[PDB]
Structures are given as structure tokens and as C-alpha cells.
Amino acid sequence: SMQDPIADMLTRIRNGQAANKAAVTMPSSKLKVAIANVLKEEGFIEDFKVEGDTKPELELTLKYFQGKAVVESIQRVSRPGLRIYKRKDELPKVMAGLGIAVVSTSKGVMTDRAARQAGLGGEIICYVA
Amino acid sequence: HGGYKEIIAKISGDGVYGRLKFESGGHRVQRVPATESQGRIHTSACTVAVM
Amino acid sequence: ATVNQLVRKPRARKVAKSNVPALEACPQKRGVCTRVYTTTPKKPNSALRKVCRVRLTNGFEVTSYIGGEGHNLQEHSVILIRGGRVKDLPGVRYHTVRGALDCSGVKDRKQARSKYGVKRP
Amino acid sequence: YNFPQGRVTDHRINLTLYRLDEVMEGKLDMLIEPIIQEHQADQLAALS
RNA sequence: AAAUUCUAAU
RNA sequence: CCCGCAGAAGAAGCACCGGCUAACUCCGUGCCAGCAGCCGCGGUAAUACGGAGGGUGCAAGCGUUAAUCGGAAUUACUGGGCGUAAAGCGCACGCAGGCGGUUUGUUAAGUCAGAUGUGAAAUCCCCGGGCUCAACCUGGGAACUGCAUCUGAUACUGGCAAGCUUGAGUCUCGUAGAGGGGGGUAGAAUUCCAGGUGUAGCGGUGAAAUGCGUAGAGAUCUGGAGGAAUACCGGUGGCGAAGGCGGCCCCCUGGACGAAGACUGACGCUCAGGUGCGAAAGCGUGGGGAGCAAACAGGAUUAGAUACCCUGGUAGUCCACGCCGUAAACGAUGUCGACUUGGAGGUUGUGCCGGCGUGGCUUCCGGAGCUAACGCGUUAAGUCGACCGCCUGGGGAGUAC
Numbered sequence: 240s241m242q243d244p245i246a247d248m249l250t251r252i253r254n255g256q257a258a259n260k261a262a263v264t265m266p267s268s269k270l271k272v273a274i275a276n277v278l279k280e281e282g283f284i285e286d287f288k289v290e291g292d293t294k295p296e297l298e299l300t301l302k303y304f305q306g307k308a309v310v311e312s313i314q315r316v317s318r319p320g321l322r323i324y325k326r327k328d329e330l331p332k333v334m335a336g337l338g339i340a341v342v343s344t345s346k347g348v349m350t351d352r353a354a355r356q357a358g359l360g361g362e363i364i365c366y367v368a
Numbered sequence: 369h370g371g372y373k374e375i376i377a378k379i380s381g382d383g384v385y386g387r388l389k390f391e392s393g394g395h396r397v398q399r400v401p402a403t404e405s406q407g408r409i410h411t412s413a414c415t416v417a418v419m
Numbered sequence: 420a421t422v423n424q425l426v427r428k429p430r431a432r433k434v435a436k437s438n439v440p441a442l443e444a445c446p447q448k449r450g451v452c453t454r455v456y457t458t459t460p461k462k463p464n465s466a467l468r469k470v471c472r473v474r475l476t477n478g479f480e481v482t483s484y485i486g487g488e489g490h491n492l493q494e495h496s497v498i499l500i501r502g503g504r505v506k507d508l509p510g511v512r513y514h515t516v517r518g519a520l521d522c523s524g525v526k527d528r529k530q531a532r533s534k535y536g537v538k539r540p
Numbered sequence: 541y542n543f544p545q546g547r548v549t550d551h552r553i554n555l556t557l558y559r560l561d562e563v564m565e566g567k568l569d570m571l572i573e574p575i576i577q578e579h580q581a582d583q584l585a586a587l588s
Numbered sequence: 589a590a591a592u593u594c595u596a597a598u
Numbered sequence: 599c600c601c602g603c604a605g606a607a608g609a610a611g612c613a614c615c616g617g618c619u620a621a622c623u624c625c626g627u628g629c630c631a632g633c634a635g636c637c638g639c640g641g642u643a644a645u646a647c648g649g650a651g652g653g654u655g656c657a658a659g660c661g662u663u664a665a666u667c668g669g670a671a672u673u674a675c676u677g678g679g680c681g682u683a684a685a686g687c688g689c690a691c692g693c694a695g696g697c698g699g700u701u702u703g704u705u706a707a708g709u710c711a712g713a714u715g716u717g718a719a720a721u722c723c724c725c726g727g728g729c730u731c732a733a734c735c736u737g738g739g740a741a742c743u744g745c746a747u748c749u750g751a752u753a754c755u756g757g758c759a760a761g762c763u764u765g766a767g768u769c770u771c772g773u774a775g776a777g778g779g780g781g782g783u784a785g786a787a788u789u790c791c792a793g794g795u796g797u798a799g800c801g802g803u804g805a806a807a808u809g810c811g812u813a814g815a816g817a818u819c820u821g822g823a824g825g826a827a828u829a830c831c832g833g834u835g836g837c838g839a840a841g842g843c844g845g846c847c848c849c850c851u852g853g854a855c856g857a858a859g860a861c862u863g864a865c866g867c868u869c870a871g872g873u874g875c876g877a878a879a880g881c882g883u884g885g886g887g888a889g890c891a892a893a894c895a896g897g898a899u900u901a902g903a904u905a906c907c908c909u910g911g912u913a914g915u916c917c918a919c920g921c922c923g924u925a926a927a928c929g930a931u932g933u934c935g936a937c938u939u940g941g942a943g944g945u946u947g948u949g950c951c952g953g954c955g956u957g958g959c960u961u962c963c964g965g966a967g968c969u970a971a972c973g974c975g976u977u978a979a980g981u982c983g984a985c986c987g988c989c990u991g992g993g994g995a996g997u998a999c
């Protein structure tokens with residue numbers, strides 16, 4: 240059964256980018272919306288939008304720079320079978336800072352350097368770089 | 369193929385054992401066998417007993 | 420393996436046993452020669468290797484190799500043995516320490532003397 | 541007996557000879573006499 | 589349609 | 599510790615030189631003597647054995663043996679695998695356990711931040727000092743990744759309360775099918791029995807012979823008995839969780855799929871122990887026995903033939919009940935869910951106007967991608983998530999206790 244919607248969202252984005260699709264559409268949720276907002280502000284997607292009321296649908300627009308996907312790798316970390324939480328002083332760095340990591344801290348879902356500025360830790364969602 | 373796997377014979381005369389008592393042992397031969405497809409050299413041995 | 424499967428049953432490590440058990444974690448042992456003889460190696464080598472059957476001080480009964488050219492060993496002689504396996508000899512697992520209690524160094528040996536217990540001339 | 545070299549050698553007295561063709565023809569009296577000699581000096585020497 | 593085998597040093 | 603005295607006067611060895619590994623020639627022996635950590639040297643022209651000359655590496659030390667970690671990603675938490683190299687239970691149900699679609703409120707258990715107490719000294723690391731330097735001694739700091747308490751945060755996980763319909767399930771109509779259990783019946787054919795006609799062969803093989811026949815065989819015709827299996831249809835066609843299921847008719851019965859409408863509201867997925875099903879052979883009791891056919895007998899072939907070939911033939915194959923629990927039980931590919939270009943078919947539903955769509959199952963080719971390669975390729979061996987099973991060189995051995 241579907242025991243991980245976030246990993247499904249990541250897989251949908253990966254399979255869309257690898258297949259040179261123009262957009263990816265999926266069922267919506269608050270945590271997915273937060274992750275999509277982080278991705279859009281960090282520049283890995285063009286835009287996202289949610290439509291509908293009873294069964295909301297979230298769609299993302301993928302972006303390609305030189306006819307190739309902007310996002311190279313994206314991998315879920317804190318899977319349901321094993322959760323990962325880290326302190327502020329040991330937040331991970333991806334590609335020596337070139338990439339980003341998404342962390343949910345007590346102030347919301349944000350990046351890793353933003354949480355370092357805030358001096359907060361939390362649960363790591365994924366490594367995207 | 370060739371000779372004997374074992375031969376036992378009797379030698380009779382005057383002075384026999386006093387001259388054939390030193391042949392009891394092993395005798396080694398190094399040569400190209402007749403039963404040889406290639407041209408390899410082979411080492412083999414035989415055992416001799418004088419009583 | 421799943422992390423759950425590993426939590427229920429962790430990984431095991433190879434025992435990695437020893438190959439000189441008669442020494443019992445001792446660099447050398449002392450023994451008595453009950454039989455001195457010769458033996459023939461495996462394919463393809465061919466010689467008449469000199470070995471000995473030795474009873475140690477802990478009760479073990481093993482076979483040892485006598486290196487060098489010529490030895491003065493015989494039955495009822497006490498010797499010192501150490502580890503080391505002769506490959507083409509099946510069953511030999513130890514080496515006789517030359518220069519020990521009742522075995523003398525190789526006569527007229529001017530090279531690698533310390534390995535055969537010969538005094539410097 | 542080495543046929544490639546035609547050499548017959550005796551290890552008991554360390555005596556090598558290059559007359560194998562004669563030896564294989566029943567002329568081994570040139571092989572047994574040197575042994576008997578060495579077998580007799582011991583017999584006199586073994587008198588103690 | 590019959591029909592076994594080729595030891596051991598290049 | 600300092601000064602003076604006489605004299606270079608008292609003071610260098612060990613291992614190695616074929617490759618891995620820095621460093622080569624001569625003589626002796628001739629698979630002998632011997633060397634070896636792994637490949638491997640030595641058979642009368644040895645850079646590998648022994649000696650000499652030369653060189654290389656450490657040096658008051660040098661080598662060997664024993665023990666531990668590393669290399670070994672070779673137990674893979676960091677950080678491995680299971681189509682063919684070792685490795686998916688024969689299949690399914692299911693308790694404990696592991697995991698959990700979406701919204702709101704509340705709690706602060708997990709998680710995070712700060713503060714406090716504690717984490718003996720020595721040791722380790724950093725900045726300095728003292729022995730003529732060093733080893734050594736020592737001043738100060740850093741560290742001891744931990745534990746407990748107090749105060750805060752509510753994004754994610756958990757608890758409680760209320761919901762929602764998309765996962766899951768129920769109801770109405772219909773369809774296809776060797777799905778299962780029991781009973782009845784039909785036709786062809788083999789065998790046996792009785793009788794008619796008829797006379798010298800029948801059968802079998804590469805060729806023969808054993809065998810049957812003048813006591814009338816084989817052939818042909820008529821009547822009867824009993825047992826087993828269902829020609830054509832028939833098709834990489836259909837059904838079933840797997841094993842498996844094939845004449846026709848009836849009775850009881852499981853599942854799947856499709857078109858619309860209504861209903862419950864997370865009731866779900868996986869599953870160690872446990873439980874049930876499970877080809878053929880085999881076992882116990884009681885029946886049945888046409889054909890076939892282990893064991894057995896005879897005749898051929900052969901150097902021999904305890905076989906292949908021929909003539910016969912008993913258990914067994916069949917039925918009822920009860921055991922057994924194994925297969926190359928194979929797609930050598932565990933179950934569930936999501937995402938990702940195409941083409942040619944087969945089978946079974948439904949909507950619209952011979953054409954245009956939309957579901958289920960199934961065969962072949964092939965793109966990206968993956969693989970050691972062969973190959974797989976929307977029914978993945980591609981990209982992910984949850985749970986279970988299994989593997990760690992070849993024999994010994996799926997063997998002993």
C-alpha cells in the first residue's frame with residue numbers, strides 16, 4: 240500500500256525530469272505544499288499550483304537549462320522504516336554547500352542553511368542537489 | 369604393450385650369487401617412451417630382487 | 420537485510436581459527452623425538468624430505484620439519500619447534516629451530532647463519 | 541640410465557660412465573667390479 | 589545398421 | 599656538572615638480490631642435495647639450491663616465531679547481495695510484531711533550543727616552561743560525543759476527540775470459463791467367452807529366434823461379459839493461490855469481470871511461531887483388474903550384456919477411507935502500492951455513430967534505463983516505499999549426533 244506520499248512525490252519529480260515531461264500532477268497535501276514551496280524558492284522548479292476543493296490536486300512545472308534537467312539527484316532520507324533527526328551543530332551539507340537539504344524544524348519546513356541561521360534542528364526530509 | 373610386469377627366473381652356475389647380489393634395488397631410466405604421442409622425456413623406475 | 424531484520428538478528432563475524440594449534444599461542448615449544456624418518460613431497464616436486472615425529476610438553480603428537488643440509492637428530496632427542504608450514508609436505512605444520520637444545524647448526528654455512536644457528540667464524 | 545646422454549651412473553660408489561650402449565648389451569662387468577672392491581675394503585675395516 | 593581404450597617431464 | 603692528560607688511540611653487525619619488492623655475474627651439483635609468505639625453482643649451459651665477487655635495506659641492532667587491527671566494501675549502521683556465479687520458503691490464511699490516505703482541535707511522549715548539576719586524577723589534543731636537545735617531567739586550556747532536572751517551539755512521528763472519501767468493503771443487473779464435490783448415461787476401440795465359413799501359416803525383427811497353429815491358428819461374421827480413457831472440436835486458447843482441471847446431463851457450490859446507482863468510513867499492507875492445501879512414486883484395510891507395465895523368465899546382439907531389441911508377465915496404474923509431505927513443486931524472478939516513449943496480435947464485457955472509444959486477462963518484438971554479459975524492457979531484471987524469507991570459497995554435507 241501507499242505508506243510514503245513524500246517519496247512518491249520525489250519519485251514523480253524524478254521520473255518526470257528523466258522523461259522530459261513538462262509537468263507532474265499528483266494528489267495534494269500540506270507537507271507536499273511546503274516542500275514544493277521550498278523547491279520553488281530555491282530555484283529547482285518553475286512554479287506549483289493546487290486546484291480543487293474536495294480532492295485537491297498539486298502540479299509542479301519542471302525546468303530544464305541546457306535541454307537537461309535542473310535537478311540531478313533527489314533522494315528521501317527519513318523514511319517511515321527509519322527516521323533521521325539531527326541537532327543544529329550537525330546539519331548535513333550536500334555537495335559542499337552547492338546543493339541543499341530540506342529540514343522540518345519547529346518553525347516550519349525550510350532549508351539547512353536557514354536552520355543554521357535560526358540555530359535550530361529538526362527532521363531531514365530529503366537531499367536534493 | 370611391451371615387456372613384463374614381473375619376471376622371475378633362476379640363474380644356475382658357479383659363482384652366481386657372489387656377483388649378482390649388488391643388483392637388488394631400484395633402477396631409474398630417463399628416456400623418450402615408445403607409448404608417447406609427443407616428444408617428451410619421461411623418468412621411470414624398476415625394482416630388482418636377487419635372492 | 421532490512422534494518423528490522425538486523426535488529427532482530429545482528430551480523431555474525433567469522434571465527435577465523437588458527438593453523439598452529441599445538442603451540443597454544445606460544446612462540447616455541449619443547450618436545451621429544453619419537454621417530455626420525457624421510458618422506459616424499461606432492462606433485463610436482465620430488466625429493467626425500469627429512470621430518471620427525473615429536474611429542475610436546477602438553478601431550479600433543481605432531482610432525483616437524485628439519486631444515487638445512489644434514490642433522491644429528493635421532494630417537495630420544497629433545498628439540499625446540501616453532502610455527503611454519505611446509506607446503507608440498509602433507510601433514511607437516513611446524514619447523515625445528517636449528518641451534519636449539521639438541522640440534523646443531525648446519526656445518527659449513529656462511530650465509531644466512533642466524534637462521535640455522537651457526538656461529539660467526 | 542640416461543639415453544639422451546648415453547650415461548650410466550651408480551650412486552652407491554658415485555661412479556658415472558658414458559658407455560650405456562655396451563651396458564645394455566650384457567657387458568655390465570664394467571659396472572659390478574668397482575662395487576665389489578668397495579664392498580671388500582669395508583669387510584676388512586669392519587674387524588673391531 | 590557395427591565400434592572399447594590412449595598412464596606418467598616439453 | 600666543570601677543568602687538565604696521553605694518544606685515532608678502546609668500540610659494526612644482521613637480513614636480502616625471479617615477480618609481488620630496492621638491488622647480478624661466475625663456479626659446484628644435476629627433480630639428488632636443497633629453497634619457499636603466494637605463484638612456484640632444481641631433469642648436465644639454474645640471475646630462485648650451496649660458495650665467491652658485487653649491490654641493496656636497517657644499524658647496537660638485525661631476522662624468525664606467537665598474538666591483534668588494517669588492507670577485507672570478505673557480516674556491507676556508515677557501506678553488499680538473491681533469473682543463469684552462493685542465495686525467494688511448493689502455495690495460501692493468519693495471532694504477536696513492523697509500517698500508516700486526508701482536515702481541524704488538544705497534549706509536548708519522541709524531536710529541537712537555552713540554562714543548571716554531574717562526567718575523579720592521570721592519558722589523548724593545543725599554547726608555554728625545566729633537564730645542553732630528545733624520550734621524560736610539568737602550568738593552563740580544550741575535550742570526556744553521556745546522564746538527570748527546569749523553562750520554552752510545535753514543523754514531522756505518537757496519544758486523545760471529531761470529521762472526509764480517493765485505499766478497503768457491501769447491495770442491485772449481466773457475462774465467460776477443462777474451477778470443485780456427487781450421481782446417471784452414450785459411442786468408438788482393445789481383451790476374453792460361445793458359435794458359423796475356411797485352410798496352412800500367424801507374429802516379430804536390421805536379420806532372426808522365443809511364442810501361437812492341423813487338438814483347426816491368423817482372417818472374416820454373429821451374440822454376450824467386464825474394465826479404463828474420452829478421437830474430431832482443440833488454438834504459446836480458458837479457469838485456479840499453487841499442485842492441477844477435457845465426452846454429454848443433472849444436483850450442491852467457490853471465485854473473477856463489466857455498466858450505472860446507493861451505502862460504511864482507514865475497517866489497510868506484510869507476517870517469525872501456528873494452521874490448511876499440495877504432481878507422481880510409496881504405505882494400511884476392503885474391492886476391482888480390459889490395456890499398459892518395475893521385479894521375474896525365455897530368445898537374440900556382444901569380447902562380456904545383470905542393458906538398449908523381441909515374446910510373456912506380478913506388484914502398481916482404477917475405486918472408498920486413512921497416512922506420507924517430497925519434485926528441474928521453474929518464470930530457477932516473495933507479497934503489496936505509485937511513476938516512466940511504442941508496435942503487431944489473441945480472449946472476454948460495455949458506450950456512440952462498418953467505423954469511433956473505454957475496462958479485465960494474455961503472447962511476440964522493441965526505445966530510454968539497468969546488467970559481467972546473455973538479456974529484461976509498463977506483466978521490468980528501469981525509478982521509489984513497507985514487511986517477510988535466504989547467502990558469505992570448493993569438497994566433507996543438507997552428512998553425523
Ligand SMILES: [Mg+2]
Nearest residue numbers: 592593594595
Ligand atoms: Mg582397460
Ligand SMILES: [Mg+2]
Nearest residue numbers: 405594595596
Ligand atoms: Mg591422455
Ligand SMILES: [Mg+2]
Nearest residue numbers: 615619620621
Ligand atoms: Mg626489482
Ligand SMILES: [Mg+2]
Nearest residue numbers: 531614633634
Ligand atoms: Mg633465501
Ligand SMILES: [Mg+2]
Nearest residue numbers: 625626643644
Ligand atoms: Mg652451471
Ligand SMILES: [Mg+2]
Nearest residue numbers: 530646647648
Ligand atoms: Mg644461492
Ligand SMILES: [Mg+2]
Nearest residue numbers: 645646647648
Ligand atoms: Mg644463488
Ligand SMILES: [Mg+2]
Nearest residue numbers: 670671672674
Ligand atoms: Mg570491516
Ligand SMILES: [Mg+2]
Nearest residue numbers: 435668669670
Ligand atoms: Mg587478516
Ligand SMILES: [Mg+2]
Nearest residue numbers: 420421674677
Ligand atoms: Mg544496507
Ligand SMILES: [Mg+2]
Nearest residue numbers: 672678679990
Ligand atoms: Mg557480494
Ligand SMILES: [Mg+2]
Nearest residue numbers: 682683684930
Ligand atoms: Mg549450476
Ligand SMILES: [Mg+2]
Nearest residue numbers: 682683684685
Ligand atoms: Mg544458483
Ligand SMILES: [Mg+2]
Nearest residue numbers: 686688931932
Ligand atoms: Mg516461487
Ligand SMILES: [Mg+2]
Nearest residue numbers: 691692868869
Ligand atoms: Mg496475507
Ligand SMILES: [Mg+2]
Nearest residue numbers: 696697698756
Ligand atoms: Mg501505529
